[PDB]
Design a protein around this ligand. Structure first.
Ligand SMILES: *[C@@H]1O[C@H](CO)[C@@H](O)[C@H](O)[C@H]1NC(C)=O
Lengths: 24, 48
């Protein structure tokens, strides 16, 4: 069987703090 | 490998690879820490 993942599976890309920012 | 072998001799190689990332440090140079100072302009150094 299959299903839609939606917006799952984002993770923290690096061990650094950031706030109020849009990081690519 | 025979002792009569210069370039044909064995060499022991150690490669040190450094995990120079932003996690907690755990392997450090022999440098002694100071006390910590606040609200004053300081020439600081944390983990390097
Ligand atoms: C995803 O799976 C559904 C059925 O579970 C199917 O209708 C759809 O065409 C599939 N899409 C892709 C891109 O696999």
């Amino acid at each position: 069987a299959y299903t839609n993942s939606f917006t799952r599976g984002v993770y923290y890309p690096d061990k650094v703090f950031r706030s109020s920012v849009l990081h690519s | 490998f025979q002792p009569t072998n210069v370039g044909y001799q064995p060499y022991r190689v150690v490669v040190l690879s450094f995990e120079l990332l932003h996690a907690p440090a755990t392997v450090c140079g022999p440098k002694k820490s100071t006390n910590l100072v606040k609200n004053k302009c300081v020439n600081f150094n944390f983990n390097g």
